[PDB]
Amino acid sequence: ESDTGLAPPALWDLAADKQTLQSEQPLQVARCTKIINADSEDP
Amino acid sequence: EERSKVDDLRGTPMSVGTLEEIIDDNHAIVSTSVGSEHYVSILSFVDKDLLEPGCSVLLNHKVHAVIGVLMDDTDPLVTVMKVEKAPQETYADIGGLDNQIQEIKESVELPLTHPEYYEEMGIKPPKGVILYGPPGTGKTLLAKAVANQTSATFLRVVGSELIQKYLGDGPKLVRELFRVAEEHAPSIVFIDEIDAIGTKRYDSNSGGEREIQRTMLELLNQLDGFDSRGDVKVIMATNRIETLDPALIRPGRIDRKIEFPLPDEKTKKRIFQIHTSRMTLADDVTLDDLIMAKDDLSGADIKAICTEAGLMALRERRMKVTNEDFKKSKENVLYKKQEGTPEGLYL
């Protein structure tokens, strides 16, 4: 069956109210990459 | 009510993601199916206990946040290779190789059943046992003969259900196998044909060999992590040995190098009897002339005779097999490798 992390409701009931909503619009999505080099006095 | 709100809080076209690593600060790094890696946040109803590096989760399209953990039949690739049923005949199937039986009995059954010889003196049991020699010299038949007489679970690895292309599935199933070896009885790790993965220790620059050398190094690491193994026995078998990994032949890891030399016409007569046992052997046939004439044939050849003897009976619409069928199968099947012998020169 599609479980999808059921978590029987005692540990996330307060967390699912609006803390999810503050993780949606303020918290953006980033990506991890690699740095080749840099420059002096100007990044 | 509350279950329907959170099941509708996330987006409906949920995308199948892939975990890479976990940071314990309400976010983590994941990986898409295209390999693009996204530094996303994780929710709090996600049941943060089963989260493992290598599992799959559910992601969003907008922010790609970790919606929920995804099952994967929990491991389809360690439960198939585990033997559940009984193997072949225990000790009477084989013959003539009783020199090596005391080796494998005292190295496996004696550390398990009677671990007091090792405690009266203080001599540790061996871990690695290597089976090499001629190709098809009866290494498959011997490994099933030992694994029948047992009191513990047994593991059977093909050797080709280890290398994938997912960049992490190589070293993953090493821990998956040894956990099954740990959670169950102190089983016998039988990984057959390790020569395709372990040879000559070369490093190249492409992305083709890097999935081999790490998995080779991680298995050598996970075998000898030296923390807690619980007396895991490992049997490794290939045909050849000269193009293999030298640092597994060195002591400290494997101190048993069992060879299987070539048999004689003495061991054949049982193999002729065993292969001509589950058939309609008519009482007008002779097998002893077929043993006396041909001087080089293995268990695969006799089985190839028995099938050809079975085919010739079905051609002329019969049930039993006549003696001329065994003669014509001996003169048709066995004429494929008879080449090269110094006759009439030696005494």
Add this chain to the structure above:
Amino acid sequence: LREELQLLQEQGSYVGEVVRAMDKKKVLVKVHPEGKFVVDVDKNIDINDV
């Protein structure tokens, strides 16, 4: 001709090969250029479509 023209002004549909999936009105569709997707069924079709 208007019926053929009104459905013409409409975006294309994907394809997904499904061998098996789960129940509870969510199926498992794997597209060709990308990976798998847990999606939702329609109301014009059934669920027993595995």
